[PDB]
């Protein structure tokens, strides 16, 4: 029932890799410090996302067995997960406990950033529903690894090789849930259910980006490839 020495090892190693990301406080201090125009916020988003993808690629290469997969399957797994991982990490940041009144200003700054009304509602519904789950740092790290190692991605040639890498992560996540929240037995199924919500963000992503209230939508060359814009 408890984590085996192997599972604790995999867990601590996943956590250390995940924590090499840009710190939440760094992101929120900037946003909370002062109100920027839509033009400036779009520039902040593209620089944040470029750095996120760069760190995501590094975290992915350290996932056990990923480097043994077919080079074309590796590209499809990364391209297919980059948007979901950005929204999952943004939800983590959004839900970080801050001093009284700060998270309300954060929500106000994000609502007034330049994103269109059509995309604010599903975005905030996701962040709140993530918030209710009260996820630990390990749950966010394992869930990100599970999102990346999704065997059921379009343009994947060898699905079982991916399934074999994801299954030990699913098993660690389940045990973690059955220990951190014994009073909520659906917690594990409910985390996995939120992944189905993340997939919908990826399908309308190009449209969400182009509907930002700016005069010109400039992207970096790495984002052009990853976001298909």
């Amino acid at each position: 029932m408890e984590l085996t020495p192997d599972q604790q090892t995999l867990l601590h190693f996943i956590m250390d890799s995940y924590n090499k990301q840009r710190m939440p406080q760094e992101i929120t201090n900037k946003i909370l410090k002062e109100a920027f125009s839509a033009e400036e916020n779009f520039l902040i988003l593209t620089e944040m996302a470029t750095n996120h993808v760069q760190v995501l690629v590094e975290f992915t290469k350290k996932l056990p067995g990923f480097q043994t997969l077919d080079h074309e399957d590796q590209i499809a797994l990364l391209k297919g997960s980059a948007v979901e991982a950005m929204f999952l990490r943004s939800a983590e940041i959004f839900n970080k406990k801050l001093p009284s009144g700060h998270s309300d200003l954060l929500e106000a700054r994000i609502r007034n950033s330049g994103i269109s009304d059509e995309y604010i509602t599903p975005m905030f519904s996701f962040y709140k529903s993530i918030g209710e789950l009260k996820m630990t740092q390990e749950e966010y790290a394992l869930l990100t690894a599970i999102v990346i190692l999704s065997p059921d991605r379009q343009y994947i040639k060898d699905r079982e090789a991916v399934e074999k890498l994801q299954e030990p992560l699913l098993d660690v996540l389940q045990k973690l849930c059955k220990i951190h929240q014994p009073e909520n037995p659906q917690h594990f199924a409910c985390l996995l259910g939120r992944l189905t919500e993340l997939r919908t963000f990826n399908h309308h992503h190009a449209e969400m980006l182009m509907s930002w209230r700016v005069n010109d939508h400039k992207f970096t060359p790495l984002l052009c490839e990853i976001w298909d814009v």
């Binding site: 690629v57 391209k79 060359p221």
Partner: peptide, 11 residues
């Protein structure tokens, strides 16, 4: 194509 992605993954 995805040449920047291919590069980052190989490197």
């Amino acid at each position: 194509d995805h040449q920047l992605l291919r590069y980052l993954l190989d490197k």
